[PDB]
């Protein structure tokens, strides 16, 4: 259960196409009330996730 930006980045480095990790980061950012940052991180997840994971996309 990542709670810091460092932990979120560690989870994403462990798995970059991790849709659960990206969704958790987006939920955390929305909870911290960062809509633009959440959108940018979603864009990063789109730019990083695998082309194989169509369901994740």
């Amino acid at each position: 259960a990542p709670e810091s930006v460092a932990d979120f980045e560690r989870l994403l480095i462990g798995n970059p196409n991790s849709s659960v990790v990206w969704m958790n980061y987006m939920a955390f950012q929305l909870q911290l009330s960062e809509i633009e940052k959440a959108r940018e991180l979603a864009e990063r997840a789109l730019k990083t996730i695998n082309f194989r994971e169509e369901a994740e996309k």
Binding site: I13, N15, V21, E40, E43, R44
Partner: protein, 1083 residues
């Protein structure tokens, strides 16, 4: 000027308010100094006393009179001693109202002025006034002690004797506090000064050229000491007047003091192996003189109307451009404009006519020269419009380590002994004349040693400094002076260290050329031969010159500078001296050496290996052009690491076990419009030319050898073919073909692919361009820049070796490594351009350690010293970095960012690097710099920072190749032909790096791995040991729901959730390296 002016000015005010002082401490010390005045007026006086009288006085007293050396004697003290109420004054940055909040702690001087009726016209001779001052201050200190024992502040006050900026001729009083007048927290101190009134002795009788110690040579330091003590206050008044006349005086003053502090300079006497003499006081004096005038036309170059930044500009440029020592000097009046004269008195000469004083007698010529070099450096970095240099100027302290400030260090132990022991110990003599020219033997030896080293090297260095390890300036009250006994001496040091800013182009020269020859032996040749003694010889050269000169022997382990300084000191200074630098010795030892003839004598700047390589390539190159083909050969461009002076171990014939053995060359044909338009068909056409070329070469150049290696290093191109050619010079190249259709086809694939596929294809095109297009520009600029920057090749070689030792090279790419290593050279600020292997490597490590790639990008100006990045280009690169980081605010997809005229994108060489790898690199740099800071630089520290950690490694696989590859690689602790079977060539080749490459391909989703790329240098004595270090990603180390593309080897903990399968993975690795696996170690 406006943009930089505004930014620089806001930085000025920001820094000054950051470092601003404390008014509470101001008033604390103000009331304390008022109490001090009261104590002064309470102190009674002392009448006229003889040597015996004062001797009995201070013999029964605990306080001992700190007599200057030599001490006064009864046989010549026909005069006497007296003490009256002295005039009192305040001096310092506080007195000029420009104080700051020094973290170390400062002090403010207060001057006591001895009475004229106590004086006589016959007192400035032979230490008469000096002994007068000595007894005056001794009495003052005793009565201050008794009044302190009266007022009962002795519980937290600290009283010590000191020297005025380490001037033995001027002992002063030092006062500090410790934990209502407890000013300890103010971190201030007090300096009691004992001086003379204005026009007490004749200034033209006290000029430096004058002699005032009868026994005739001048007495310059004696003159300056006494006359400064005489006219201390007139400078203070003049400075105050100028400060009131102008507006930004305190601002310029604080800028100057901060800059000099960062450089490592002060008003401390520089004449005795110390770097200083120029500090805030004389800085203010200089600003006043320049606002008083300054030009040779005596014009007002400094107008009173500038701002602080403008004043700093004027002062620093005047220092950088105007000579004060050799061929010019400046002259002014404190009561009359400042005029510059083209006469240099062979010492820095700022001369006040109103008081007949040269202020700058605290200068060594070396100190003046090195300060002028800093002045020029700051001019160029302050005229630099593109990049901001405020941090590099003010927010960095270069004087933290000698090995970083300066290029070479040499430690010498000197067991001289005593005053009498010097005669049998020192080669030179120290008689009466030597005493009067250098009063203190430390000064004498410092000048002697600087002169001998300077004459012994000359062209071989740009700058020189000397430091006696063990110098002190403070001593207790109960002592006549400072007393030390260690180091085989009785003097204020332990040993010495010479330190050298070296010229790299001139460092390596084999022959120290001297003067010419005639039948009459002229003065210069005579002194040259007498100096060199046995080494001197007459020798002739091909142009037919007959010149006395000296030869040396080049070595792969130590510099010609080492040998020269060793001989020079052992002969012309002392026979008992001990000289070394094992640090640089061991550095050269660690830099790999090739199995070539006379490699031991080979210098480090020797590129003869590279040049033979280039020559054989040229032969083959002519052969290919004169070959005939269906298409003409447009051009052949080498892209080899060897071609750009960056291979770890220099290329050696037939040494095919080197990974860099096969240098690459792009082979670009002429533009035909009949290429295939499909990607793989095009690749096969390239193979078709290569096969045709191979056939023709095999037929008509039977001496060469050839085969075809199938490369697929570029993603999703299964058809790369490289023609490997072995040339009977024992070298090997690989050819590949380039085409504008390659470029266009890659772009078209980008366009056609789906958007979810786009980023991967972008990465593939990126790898393509990095290998094929930009690599050429990079290697061109790199070669050219290297020749301008000699030491770059050895430093980057050793850096790359270090990265292999730490097992990072399997991930960091050669181009990125070379970019980082070239950073310090192309961006020398604030240091110099590195001039030794040690200095360069440590500068690289310091940079990489202090680099914050999360915020700081990297833009490199690959240019020769004085096609530079214009302002628009710089802005664009900064914009690229900002957009990239905005998209990736954590650096997950990209850590480093390095840009150049060659690479406006700042991506080519930095993509695809795991964040664990990047942060580990930063951590290793940090630990190395901290280790150097703590343990002190020594060969043990060198071994520690070169040995791997083998820590934070989830698993470690120790393997060993069946054959020793060190000899075949060609590094000394040798093959001479090619195997008849290229298959046997492959057999001899090393597999482990490609093993780890394939394995990383397999498990990059889950595991990160590292190996040793270069066995023959890090494979132990036999050059056969390798290690694979492996880390597991966090959540795969954890657990996940088992879905269809699990992309791991796992063990299910539930019927829907799984956990990863550590031991099965280890078994897979072991079977993969079955023949080579020897040991396994888990977490």
């Amino acid at each position: 000027e406006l943009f930089k002016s505004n930014i620089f000015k806001l930085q000025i005010d920001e820094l000054l308010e950051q470092v601003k002082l404390k008014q509470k401490h101001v008033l604390k010390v103000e009331k304390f100094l008022h109490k001090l005045y009261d104590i002064l007026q309470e102190i009674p006086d002392w009448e006229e006393k003889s040597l015996a009288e004062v001797d009995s006085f201070f013999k029964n007293k605990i306080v001992s009179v700190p007599f200057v050396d030599p001490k006064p004697i009864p046989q010549n003290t026909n005069y006497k001693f007296n003490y009256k109420k002295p005039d009192i004054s305040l001096i310092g940055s506080f007195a000029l109202k420009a104080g700051i909040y020094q973290p170390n702690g400062s002090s403010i001087d207060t001057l006591l002025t001895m009475p004229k009726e106590l004086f006589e016209k016959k007192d400035f001779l032979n230490f008469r006034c000096l002994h007068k001052r000595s007894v005056y201050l001794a009495y003052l200190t005793h009565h201050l002690l008794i009044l302190l024992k009266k007022d009962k502040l002795d519980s937290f006050l600290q009283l010590e004797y000191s020297y005025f900026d380490n001037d033995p001729l001027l002992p002063i009083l030092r006062i500090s506090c410790s934990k209502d007048y407890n000013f300890y927290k103010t971190r201030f101190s007090i300096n009691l000064l004992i001086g003379f009134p204005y026009k007490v002795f004749e200034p033209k009788k006290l000029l430096p050229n004058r002699n005032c110690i009868r026994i005739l040579p001048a007495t310059p330091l004696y003159n300056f000491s006494v006359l400064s003590s005489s006219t201390h206050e007139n400078y203070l008044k003049y400075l105050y007047k100028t400060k009131k006349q102008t507006e930004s005086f305190v601002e310029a003053t604080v800028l100057g003091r901060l800059w000099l502090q960062q450089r490592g300079f002060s008003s401390n006497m520089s004449h005795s192996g110390s770097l200083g003499g120029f500090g805030t006081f004389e800085f203010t004096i200089l600003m006043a003189a320049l606002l008083n005038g300054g030009g040779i036309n005596s014009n007002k170059i400094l107008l009173h109307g500038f701002s602080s930044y403008q004043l700093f500009k004027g002062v620093i440029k005047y220092l950088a451009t105007m000579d004060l020592c050799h061929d010019g000097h400046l002259q002014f009046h404190s009561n009359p404009a400042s005029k510059y004269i083209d006469e240099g008195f062979q010492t820095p000469t700022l001369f006040d006519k109103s008081t007949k004083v040269n202020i700058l007698t605290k200068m060594t010529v070396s100190s003046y020269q090195i300060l002028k070099e800093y002045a020029g450096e700051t001019l160029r970095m302050l005229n630099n419009v593109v990049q901001d240099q405020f941090s590099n100027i003010f927010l960095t302290n270069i004087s933290r380590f000698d090995n970083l400030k300066y290029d070479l260090c040499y430690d010498v132990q000197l067991p001289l002994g005593k005053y009498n022991n010097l005669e049998t110990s020192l080669a030179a003599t120290f008689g009466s004349m030597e005493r009067v020219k250098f009063i203190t033997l430390e000064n004498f030896l410092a000048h002697k040693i600087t002169n001998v080293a300077r004459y012994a090297l000359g062209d071989r260095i740009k700058y020189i400094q000397i430091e006696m390890v063990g110098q002190k300036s403070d001593f207790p009250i109960t002592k006549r002076k400072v007393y030390s006994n260690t180091g085989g001496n009785h003097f204020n040091f332990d040993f010495v260290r010479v330190k050298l800013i070296v010229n790299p182009s001139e460092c390596d020269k084999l022959v120290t050329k001297g003067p010419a020859h005639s039948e009459t032996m002229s003065t210069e040749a005579a002194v040259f031969k007498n100096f060199w003694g046995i080494k001197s010889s007459l020798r002739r050269f091909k142009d037919g010159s007959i010149t006395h000169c000296c030869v040396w022997s080049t070595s792969s382990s130590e510099p010609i500078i080492s040998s020269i300084v060793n001989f020079a000191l052992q002969k012309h200074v002392s026979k008992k001296a001990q000289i070394s630098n094992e640090t640089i010795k061991k550095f050269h030892n660690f830099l790999p050496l090739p199995n070539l003839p006379s490699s031991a004598k080979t210098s480090v700047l020797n590129l003869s290996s590279f040049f033979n390589l280039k020559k054989s390539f040229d032969d083959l190159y002519k052969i290919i052009f004169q070959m005939k083909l269906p298409l003409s050969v447009k051009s052949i461009l080498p892209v080899g690491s060897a071609f750009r002076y960056t291979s770890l171990c220099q290329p050696v014939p037939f040494a095919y076990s080197d990974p860099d053995f096969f240098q690459d060359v792009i082979l670009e044909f002429e533009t035909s419009p009949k290429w295939p338009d499909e990607i793989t068909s095009l690749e096969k056409a390239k193979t078709a030319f290569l096969l045709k070329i191979q056939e023709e070469l095999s037929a008509n150049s039977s001496t060469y050898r050839s085969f075809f290696s199938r490369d697929e290093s570029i993603p999703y191109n299964l058809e790369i073919v490289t023609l490997n050619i072995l040339t009977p010079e024992g070298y090997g190249f690989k050819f590949r073909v380039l085409t504008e259709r390659d470029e266009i086809l890659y772009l078209r694939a980008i366009a056609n692919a789906r958007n979810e596929l786009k980023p991967e294809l972008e990465a593939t095109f990126l790898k393509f361009t990095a290998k094929y297009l930009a690599s050429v520009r990079h290697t061109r600029t790199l070669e050219n820049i290297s020749h301008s920057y000699q030491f770059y090749s050895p430093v980057v070689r050793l850096f790359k070796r270090w990265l292999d030792t730490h097992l990072l090279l399997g991930h960091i790419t050669d181009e990125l490594a070379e970019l980082i290593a070239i950073k310090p050279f192309v961006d020398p600020a604030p240091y110099f351009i590195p001039g030794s292997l040690e200095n360069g490597f440590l500068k690289v490590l310091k940079f990489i350690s202090q680099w914050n790639w999360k915020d700081d990008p990297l833009i490199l100006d690959l240019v020769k010293p004085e096609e530079r990045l214009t302002l628009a280009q710089y802005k664009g690169i900064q914009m690229n970095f900002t957009n990239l980081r905005n998209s990736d605010p954590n650096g997950t997809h990209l850590q480093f960012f390095v840009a150049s005229k060659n690479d406006p994108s700042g991506i080519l060489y930095s993509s695809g690097i795991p964040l664990p790898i990047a942060t580990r690199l930063t951590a290793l740099a940090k630990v190395a710099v901290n280790l150097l800071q703590t343990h002190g630089l020594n060969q043990q520290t060198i071994n520690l920072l070169f040995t791997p950690g083998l820590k934070d490694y989830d698993f470690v696989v120790d393997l060993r190749t069946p054959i020793g590859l060190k000899s075949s690689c060609g590094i000394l602790s040798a093959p001479s032909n090619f195997p008849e079977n290229l298959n046997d060539l492959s057999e001899k080749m090393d597999p482990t790096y490609q093993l780890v490459k394939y394995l990383n391909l397999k498990y990059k989703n889950s595991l990160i791995l590292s190996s040793r790329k270069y066995i023959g240098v890090n494979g132990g004595e036999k050059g056969d040991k390798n290690v694979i270090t492996g880390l597991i990603k966090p959540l795969f180390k954890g657990a996940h729901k088992f879905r269809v593309n699990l992309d791991c080897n796992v063990k299910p903990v539930d019927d829907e959730n799984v956990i990863l399968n550590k031991e099965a993975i280890f078994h897979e690795i072991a079977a993969f390296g079955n023949d080579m696996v020897i040991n396994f170690e888990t977490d």
